[PDB]
């Protein structure tokens, strides 16, 4: 718990398209074998791009390469697209039976919009603090609302606020939530206080409504929150 | 709590491509209006395709509109595609000042594989069952494993089970873990005890490795688990 260890890969990589990239890893144990497995979104699963240091999947585009020396692996994109954006995990084994990640490499490829942060784990009785920062539009003449989805479940309205301040919330979280707006930040943020299992889920800035779900033209992409 | 107030939509509708889908939702106050959201998957964020019973964002093409009547809407997709495929929300107010959602309609338009289940809400000190169903290939002639990754973090080896059913565990979960095969209904199955936070995370089975990270060439859609 107080002690790790990981394979060592770097943070980040930056390509313009067109451009051949590498990256490297090291560690494992001393005859152990690489692969490689690309994540575009926290929210999808990984799939294998090399195994065995070298081999590719089926599926895989050859553009696709990897090798091994000693202690150490490469991945190799030829041609990167925009679509080949994603972290890519390095994996093998220790001199040991386990089995070891490194931290991943984020490979980066060099209208009104809503995004939504603040959430993550949560501890019961605790409070959280969303913000959704707006742009693209005069965020000031809009009405605007938090929804929530617990896991497995439907939408469910939280609370909003119209353009001369009125708040309104749902009985859910009724003495504990503020929702709040700053126009000159273009910002609305959501307060939720005493944090019970049933806050847990994804929340959802949109925009258009206060308590008028029916006037919602645009959502956020969520922020995740776990009690 | 004990009490809920919905509005009311039907759980499902299948059509075949090309036809002609409507589906109609009811409640809300009096003089209330109805939009409707479209959520390709759990994971994904709703989009608006009606707001204010009939107008269309842009970006949402023709073939979607809406109507009201009384206390009643109707959404109406005309050529449905299997793209088209989401669970649909209604939503609206009430008479007071609160948003309304209906449940959602299932919309259905009518090879190597491994699908996880048994996620879901868990209390701690709980226990939970999570198991992958194989297909597609000679089972018991591959070694599996599970990873999982919490919020916000890197991909963790959780356990793995051999051909021969040798089994290997994390440290995180040793003593509290359990891995299995059942190769007569290729399935795994992970019983991880004395749940703590952090186990809290999205659990993935992939095929190739017990311990070795580097043979895995297939990766399920993966499990959430919430603690
Ligand atoms: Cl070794
Ligand atoms: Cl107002
Ligand atoms: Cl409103
Ligand atoms: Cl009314
Ligand atoms: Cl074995
Ligand atoms: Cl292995």
């Known amino acids: 718990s107080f002690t790790q260890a990981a394979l060592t890969q770097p943070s980040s990589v930056s390509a313009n398209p067109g451009e051949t990239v590498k990256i490297t890893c090291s560690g494992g144990g001393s005859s152990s074998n690489y692969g490689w497995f690309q994540q575009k979104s926290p929210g999808s699963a990984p799939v294998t791009v090399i195994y065995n240091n070298n081999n590719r999947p089926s599926d895989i585009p050859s553009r696709f390469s990897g090798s091994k020396s000693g202690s150490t692996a490469t991945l190799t994109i030829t041609g990167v697209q925009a679509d080949d954006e994603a972290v890519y995990f390095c994996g093998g084994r220790d001199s040991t039976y386990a089995g070891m990640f490194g931290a991943g490499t984020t490979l980066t490829v060099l209208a009104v919009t809503l995004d939504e942060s603040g959430g993550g784990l949560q501890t019961p009785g605790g409070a959280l603090s969303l913000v959704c920062?707006?742009?693209?539009?005069?965020?000031?003449?809009?009405?605007?609302?938090?929804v929530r989805q617990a896991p497995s479940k439907g939408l469910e309205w939280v609370a909003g606020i119209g353009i001369t301040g009125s708040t309104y919330y749902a009985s859910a979280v009724k003495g504990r939530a503020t929702i709040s707006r700053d126009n000159g930040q273009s910002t609305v943020r959501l307060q939720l206080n005493n944090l019970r299992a049933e806050d847990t889920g994804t929340?959802?800035?949109?925009?258009?409504?206060?308590?008028?779900?029916?006037?919602?033209?645009?959502?956020?992409?969520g922020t995740e929150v776990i009690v | 709590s004990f009490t809920q107030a919905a509005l009311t939509q039907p759980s499902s509708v299948s059509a075949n491509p090309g036809e002609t889908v409507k589906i109609t939702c009811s409640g809300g106050g009096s003089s209330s209006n109805y939009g409707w959201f479209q959520q390709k998957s759990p994971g994904s964020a709703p989009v608006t395709v009606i707001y204010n019973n009939n107008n269309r964002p842009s970006d949402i093409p023709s073939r979607f509109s809406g109507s009201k009547s009384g206390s009643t809407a109707t959404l109406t997709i005309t050529g449905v595609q299997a793209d088209d495929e989401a669970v649909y929300f209604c939503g609206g107010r009430d008479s007071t000042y609160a948003g309304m959602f209906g449940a959602g309609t299932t919309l259905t338009v009518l090879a190597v594989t491994l699908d996880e289940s048994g996620g879901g809400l868990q209390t701690p000190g709980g226990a939970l069952s999570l198991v992958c169903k194989a297909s597609?290939?000679?089972?018991?002639?591959?070694?599996m494993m599970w990873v999982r990754q919490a919020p916000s973090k890197g991909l963790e080896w959780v356990a793995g089970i051999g051909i021969t059913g040798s089994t290997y565990y994390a440290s995180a979960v040793k003593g509290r873990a359990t891995i299995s095969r059942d190769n007569g209904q290729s399935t795994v199955r992970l019983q991880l005890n004395n749940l703590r936070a952090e186990d809290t995370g999205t659990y993935y089975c992939?095929?190739?490795?017990?311990?070795?990270?580097?043979?895995?060439?297939?990766w399920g859609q993966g499990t959430e688990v919430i603690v």
């Open positions: 992939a095929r190739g490795g017990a311990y070795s990270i580097n043979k895995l060439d297939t």
């Open positions: 597609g290939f000679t089972f018991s002639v591959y070694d």
